[PDB]
Design brief:
By secondary structure, the protein is α+β, with helices and mostly antiparallel strands. It has a domain at 98-227 and 265-331: Nucleotidyltransferase, domain 5. 39% of the residues lie in helices and 9% in strands. The strands form 6 sheets. The chain has a 7-stranded mixed sheet. α25 crosses α26. The protein is globular and about 100 Å long. Bound molecules: 2'-deoxyadenosine 5'-triphosphate (DTP) and magnesium ion. The site of magnesium ion has 5 residues, from loops. The structure holds 3 DNA strands.
Amino acid sequence: TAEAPRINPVGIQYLGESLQRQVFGSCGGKDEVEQSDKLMELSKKSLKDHGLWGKKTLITDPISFPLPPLQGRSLDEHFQKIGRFNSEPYKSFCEDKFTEMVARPAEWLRKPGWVKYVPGMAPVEVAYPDEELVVFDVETLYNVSDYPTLATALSSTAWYLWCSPFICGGDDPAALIPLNTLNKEQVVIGHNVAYDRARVLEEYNFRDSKAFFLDTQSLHIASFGLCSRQRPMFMKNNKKKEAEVESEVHPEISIEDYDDPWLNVSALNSLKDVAKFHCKIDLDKTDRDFFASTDKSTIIENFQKLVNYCATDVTATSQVFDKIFPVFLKKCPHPVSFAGLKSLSKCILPTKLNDWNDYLNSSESLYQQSKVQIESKIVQIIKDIALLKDKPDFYLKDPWLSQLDWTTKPLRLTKKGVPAKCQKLPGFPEWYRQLFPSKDTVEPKITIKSRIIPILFKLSWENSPVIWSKESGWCFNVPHEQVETYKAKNYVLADSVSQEEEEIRMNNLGLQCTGVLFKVPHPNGPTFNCTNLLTKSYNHFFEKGVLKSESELAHQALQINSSGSYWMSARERIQSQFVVPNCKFPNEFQSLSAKSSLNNEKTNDLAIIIPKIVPMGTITRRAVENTWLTASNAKANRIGSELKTQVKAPPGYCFVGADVDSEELWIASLVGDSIFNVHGGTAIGWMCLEGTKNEGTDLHTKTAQILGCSRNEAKIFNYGRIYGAGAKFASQLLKRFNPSLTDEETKKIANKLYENTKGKTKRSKLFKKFWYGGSESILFNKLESIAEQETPKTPVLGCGITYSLMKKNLRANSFLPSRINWAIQSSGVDYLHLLCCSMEYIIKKYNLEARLCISIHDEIRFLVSEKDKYRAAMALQISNIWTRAMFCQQMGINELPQNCAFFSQVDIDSVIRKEVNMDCITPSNKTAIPHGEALDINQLLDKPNSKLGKPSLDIDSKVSQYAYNYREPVFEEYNKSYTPEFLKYFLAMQVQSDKRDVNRLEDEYLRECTS
DNA sequence: TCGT
DNA sequence: ACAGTCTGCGGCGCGCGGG
DNA sequence: ACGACTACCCGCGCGCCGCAGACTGT
Ligand SMILES: Nc1ncnc2c1ncn2[C@H]1C[C@H](O)[C@@H](COP(=O)(O)OP(=O)(O)OP(=O)(O)O)O1
Ligand SMILES: [Mg+2]
């Protein structure tokens, strides 16, 4: 009765019959039986060498439930037609855009609202432009308020100017620009357009908008890349332009052009630099200071110049767009990319005003209260020290105070006149003078990060007072007899020059000299020096008695350093968010659901924050936002870590979300498995697909149990090993995870693990350099081989790479690792775009009340009404199985494993936090938050309201109109270069685990090709 | 960019 | 009205922490 | 000079070196 599981030759379970019918339709293989037998023999040899043949795997009853039908014979056609469907009007508006520009009025009128100027006709007053495509710019007086002051727009036929009532007689600075974005489909082009979108009146709606704001900076970063490799390549750029500024004549063609061509193919983010690069345009920037004033009357004069400045910026932005925009179509030609960009260009953050203000006060008060007391106490200690000038015996006798300079400043006295030499602290020690920077300073300014802090607070390392040496930082003296014993402790000997300086200065003080100076260990490396001792990395040294201090303040100070540090980094930006309340604008905050359905309270407090998001701010086309993509998670000790819990949902709504599992490891394993055309052909893939996270049998969890470490540290250790990190750094990582270990044990574990993982290396003439004998050698060779292609393209979609990192622009400097990492990191972005496109299609088709709320990398959250919540969760589970199979079919495999098909957990909550069961108690927050719900596939399928409902007939008919063009996968194009016998002999050499066998195979191959 |  | 002689300011690099 | 490196973003605080600017001294 029950269906029998389906298993491939390896012990891996495939999907059930129904899902196989609905996702892959009808397909067949077995094209090369003999070659498949050979590849199976090699895979069996490797698996038996690594000892995974016959091991039990997880078997589960097949899942079967109905799915929405596809719109094509294959997945590529379906995704092409959906991607063409999601942006029909916008792309057609982006093309046919005007090139000629109309003239500008000789004079401008100061009138409140929107004024339209047409050449040859009188100016008119309009409510709002009624134009499909405009170029737009905003200017605001940031010192006075956050609301805008004036705005300028250009179209194909006319000019438009918007003026605020504040500069027209009124005294209320609160006003937003109206553009009617809820009714008319339109495209607004700008540079850093996220700043402008926050100043539009009709973007503060829960109901979805019909406008698309496009940014040129993302188009510049994506193609014609900034060359931001975060490498000396970025630094060598400013030095070259500094040299060009120095000498007017620049004969760079002799050396700089030859070794580094890439210096002439890119520029910076800024509009002046981008314009200068693409076009010969110079943009003077001297009138921005006028907007830094605190008087509105200065705005009233010079009005014509400011409006002409804004118009010049608009014209420059338009000409920059006209150059950059066609290139992005060449680099990124698949329709899904543009739709995903449009989907990520819209985000909204609901919140409450009074709670935000209370959180902002409670996060600053404790920080200032903690800081003030400790600074006052250390000032008091300095004052107590600074009266020992008269008596020489105590500052000479004391070991710690001898280090400080005690020389009195020279005094210059003029005869019959005042000295007037700007003398600071006459008759005072040098260090106390160095405390005061200027004559005006009456009170010393000191921080726990000061260098003199280990001199003020006396500190002993192994019962030895710390000494300062200019070359070796902090050192501790060791007696002559016990030196060999310290050699057992692996303490390094300090530089001989520092030894001579120490003995010379001591002989100047007296008592001759005894012992030898040993450097304090530094966590990053043995050779690296140490400059601070109150950091986090020394905290365990404070316990166990290795580092000791008589004062109890030091034990306080480290905790203070723990408590406020993140706030010290983030206090400004959090206090600079633009929050708009409901009371000021009472005709704007409309509900997502068309039916009001009551849900109105007794004047409740709702507010909205529009994030400033650059969609492609990275050379791997990832999003960059300064504040909400860097927010910390909640912790018991840290102050202000409850930031993401301020986002809340209005009454009658909730949040539904999910996170991807092992995203970059599953993609890396699939690339390796594509040679054998079977899931599990490599050992790393078999280990990755053995278990599931819900049972606790995932690879990251297994790594942690072997190393005795948490799961996050295991993830760091694995992702460091996949990219190029040596065993020496892995040993230091193991020392960092467990401090109470010796170096030799860590070296043995790291060397053994690296020998079992990577294997050995062989250099040959015909085959350049390769790895062999390891469980992951195939992946390491494959990543390099794809990274040395002349034209590198993303496998799933086909996006290109920036001109800065191409091989033809590189001759001496290589910049190799980023080229390897780039393919996988871009594939993650393609994965996110595919899920966003599928979700948009399903929400439009089945008429759900939902919109995208936030999207951190690999995480998506949606705002959903109470009625349809489980349906929204269902809309997630359909999407992922669509995306993952899309990954498999492009690489040749027409099968998908059952265990990896669905999300492990789907979250339903009222606020944003990592886990639904977290109390989220911080020093600033003393109230627990009620828990939410998490679900899996079976529990979701047991709910009665999960089913979607009846579809709409119009959507399919609209989708069917578009066209589909067949394309060839990129890896099939890569395979054409290699002759077939090369692949067979090369893979046979890779599977061997001995030098003699590899040499014999090379001899056989050379004899065969020779004759 | 630095090691040997 | 020229020629030494100190005494602050300003920019830059590097550690150090969050994702 | 041939090999050897975790990758991508965002910011703050402190010490060091290169110059303007006033004071004598003729
Ligand atoms: N230290 C790192 N070095 C390199 N890549 C990293 C590092 N940390 C994270 N990544 C990558 C791997 C993922 O694609 C992404 C972060 O996703 P994340 O959720 O942290 O991990 P994951 O998806 O592999 O595991 P999980 O099962 O916990 O979701 O960025
Ligand atoms: Mg994940």
